[PDB]
Amino acid sequence: MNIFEMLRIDEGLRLKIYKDTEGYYTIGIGHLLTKSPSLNAAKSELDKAIGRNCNGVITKDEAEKLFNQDVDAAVRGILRNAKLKPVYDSLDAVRRCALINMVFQMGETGVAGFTNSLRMLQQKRWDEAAVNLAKSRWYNQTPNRAKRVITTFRTGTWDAYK
Numbered sequence: 564m565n566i567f568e569m570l571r572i573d574e575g576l577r578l579k580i581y582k583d584t585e586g587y588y589t590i591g592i593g594h595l596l597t598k599s600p601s602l603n604a605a606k607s608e609l610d611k612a613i614g615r616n617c618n619g620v621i622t623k624d625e626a627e628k629l630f631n632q633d634v635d636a637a638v639r640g641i642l643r644n645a646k647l648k649p650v651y652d653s654l655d656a657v658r659r660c661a662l663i664n665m666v667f668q669m670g671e672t673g674v675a676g677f678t679n680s681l682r683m684l685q686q687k688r689w690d691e692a693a694v695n696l697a698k699s700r701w702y703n704q705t706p707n708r709a710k711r712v713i714t715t716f717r718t719g720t721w722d723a724y725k
């Protein structure tokens with residue numbers, strides 16, 4: 564298990580534009596296109612992202628290219644965020660992947676708002692952090708995925724993805 568395999572499980576792979584869990588146009592392995600309700604706007608974002616007129620459909624290799632870019636951007640995003648960087652640096656490699664997963668799903672700003680959970684993670688108060696993480700819109704709206712991520716933070720193992 565690694566961050567790519569983890570997010571591939573959580574996000575799936577679809578080669579046509581689809582709506583994500585929040586109703587937003589997305590493609591590939593959870594590549595958000597736009598929050599606009601306009602399908603034409605989403606198709607424009609897609610073509611810009613890929614560099615050709617895709618008419619709402621991409622190939623697996625293109626999906627995986629966007630995924631590489633998105634994972635890189637989530638990680639470097641963590642390192643550029645003054646709230647997230649110290650927590651990330653304090654963590655082991657498996658728990659780092661849990662934090663990357665949250666940022667991929669909700670964005671840096673959103674994750675940086677988990678102030679109390681982040682502090683418990685930095686303190687290595689794993690059971691307490693896990694309880695706190697679940698007190699969230701995130702958990703209530705996507706509970707099965709959040710439970711997997713939270714188990715990863717609680718244990719520092721891949722048990723929820725094996």
Ligand SMILES: [Cl-]
Binds near residue numbers: 698699
């Ligand atoms: Cl709750």
Ligand SMILES: [Cl-]
Binds near residue numbers: 706708
């Ligand atoms: Cl879920």
Ligand SMILES: [K+]
Binds near residue numbers: 573574575583593
């Ligand atoms: K998805």
